[PDB]
């Protein structure tokens, strides 16, 4: 169905050093495919996916020259940010970028993305029209004034509508066999002893992709909230995700309580309860 | 090795100004500076490879473009009296501590009207008879008068070849009427040679003044001859 390509760039200024740490991470369908790191022994673009090895050495040299240029762009910009907010070079400062395009079900451009952030806060962001800019602080308005005069938005629009879409089309055709995958969650309810005549029923959800999931606990067809103890979706390590939802219930009436799991790539939401061995 | 042409630029208020800079050294960074008399050269903007950086206090005033590594230009949208300064172009093989190779620079003066522009009146003066008698030397004095603006380049030519030996020229031209503004300038030059060299009629002496003013595409309406970029000279051979 829908697809997306992203480039998550990071620049952490190092006090006492000329160049900052530049990390550019490429994504296709919220999954890593290319990565660059300045801290590496030989700083150049490396594939993070097995299907990405298909690209010749001409492509890697072309992308490394892009990162080497970007490494200096972020270096000068970080110094310009110090002047705007009146900060010191003796401290560490972070500058992040999120650029790319997300394609629809018909393999056509739905929206173009270009977002910037300084110190983990939104700095400047290119609007949906890819012609105007959104500036948060008065410091970001200086950047907006500079980029509107030089016509930076026009150059970003050319890539976001053209090159960004053009390259994603050939990336999907080079590895469609492993990209389009929706792992269904494996759910089971576990029994845990608690204080007095109360027990904790933990509804687990393991082995699912993507991380977008919902766990529900209900009594007599009524969803339980503010009493149900849930945990944040965590990665397993092999490429799949984990999540659980627990609720303190009295022993004997535990069969009345039912767990429901909501996830994509599932024909209908999974309904289950505790099984006594 | 960094080239900057023309050496002098004349423009009207409101009209666009464009200054080109050549390097031919395959340098990654190319800087642009503003130099005002008795003031430090202020950094305007620089171009690293294809990345442009403009200073926050001057970005509104100046724009820059770089089609190739060798050529970098500085563009001024609407010219005004505040832009009247020298523009130095520097280049470095890196974006760091390594040497900045500067060009000769471009002196720009922007005025309300191009009416007061006048070509120079060059006249050579034969050495003094008493100078040849008292000292073994003879001094030739060149005189350039009634020219506007300050844009001039004087040169001494002996027997067709350019000479720098025994050449003394004023660093800045003198104002004819300093009491009132929009005044014409005057410049003097000195050429000291031996007494035998001047007395010889075979030797030739020429004073060349390279005047910088109006261009081929410059506007002109007045009856008086167009004060275009021209060369005015004065000749003298000698007296035995």
């Amino acid at each position: 169905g829908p697809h997306s390509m992203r480039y998550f760039e990071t620049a952490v200024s190092r006090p006492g050093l000329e160049e900052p740490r530049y990390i550019s991470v490429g994504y296709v369908d919220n999954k890593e495919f290319v990565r660059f790191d300045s801290d590496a022994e030989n700083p150049r673009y490396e594939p993070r996916a097995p299907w990405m090895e298909q690209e010749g050495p001409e492509y890697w040299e072309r992308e490394t020259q892009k990162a080497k240029g970007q490494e200096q762009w972020f270096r000068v910009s970080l110094r310009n940010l110090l002047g705007y907010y009146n900060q010191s070079a003796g401290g560490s400062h972070t500058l992040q970028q999120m650029s790319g395009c997300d394609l629809g079900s018909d393999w056509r451009l739905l929206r173009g993305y270009l977002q910037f952030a300084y110190e983990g806060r939104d700095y400047i962001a290119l609007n949906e029209d890819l012609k105007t800019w959104t500036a948060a602080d008065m410091a970001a308005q200086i950047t907006r004034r500079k980029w509107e005069q030089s016509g930076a938005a026009e150059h970003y629009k050319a890539y976001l509508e053209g090159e960004c879409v053009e390259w994603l089309h050939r990336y999907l055709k080079n590895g469609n066999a492993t990209l389009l995958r929706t792992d269904s969650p494996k759910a089971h309810v576990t029994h845990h002893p608690r204080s007095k005549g109360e027990v904790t029923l933990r509804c687990w959800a393991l082995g699912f992709y993507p991380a977008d999931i919902t766990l529900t606990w209900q009594l007599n067809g009524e969803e339980l909230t503010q009493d149900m103890e849930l945990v944040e979706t965590r990665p397993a390590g092999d490429g799949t995700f984990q999540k659980w939802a627990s609720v303190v219930v009295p022993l004997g009436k535990e069969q009345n309580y039912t767990c429901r799991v909501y996830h994509e790539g599932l024909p209908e939401p999974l309904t289950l309860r505790w099984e006594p061995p | 090795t960094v080239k900057q042409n023309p050496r002098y630029k004349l423009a009207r208020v409101g009209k666009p100004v464009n200054l080109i800079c050549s390097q031919t050294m395959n340098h990654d960074t190319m800087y642009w500076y503003q130099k005002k008399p008795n003031q430090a050269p202020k950094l305007l903007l620089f171009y690293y490879d294809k990345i442009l950086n403009r200073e926050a206090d001057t970005f509104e005033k100046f724009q820059s473009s770089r089609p190739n590594n060798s050529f970098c230009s500085l563009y001024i949208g609407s010219a005004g009296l505040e832009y009247s300064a020298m523009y130095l172009c520097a280049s470095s093989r890196d974006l760091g501590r390594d040497t900045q190779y500067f060009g000769p620079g471009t002196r720009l003066t922007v005025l309300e009207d191009l009416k007061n522009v006048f070509p120079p009146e060059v006249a050579v003066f034969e050495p003094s008879e008493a100078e040849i008698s008292h000292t073994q030397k003879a001094t030739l004095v060149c005189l350039a008068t009634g020219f506007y603006p300050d844009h001039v380049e004087l040169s001494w030519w002996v027997n067709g070849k350019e000479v720098h030996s025994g050449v003394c020229t004023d660093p800045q031209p003198l104002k004819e009427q300093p009491a009132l503004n929009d005044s014409r300038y005057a410049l003097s030059s000195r050429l000291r040679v031996s007494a035998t060299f001047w007395q010889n009629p075979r030797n030739h002496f020429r004073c060349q003044v390279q005047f910088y003013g109006l261009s081929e595409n410059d506007e002109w309406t007045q009856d008086r001859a167009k004060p275009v970029t021209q060369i005015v000279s004065a000749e003298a051979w000698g007296r035995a």
């Binding site: 892009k66 240029g69 000068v76 960004c164 | -």
Partner: peptide, 9 residues
């Protein structure tokens, strides 16, 4: 393929 930014901040 990644994109190169034009003018700095």
């Amino acid at each position: 393929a990644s994109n190169e930014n034009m003018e700095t901040m």
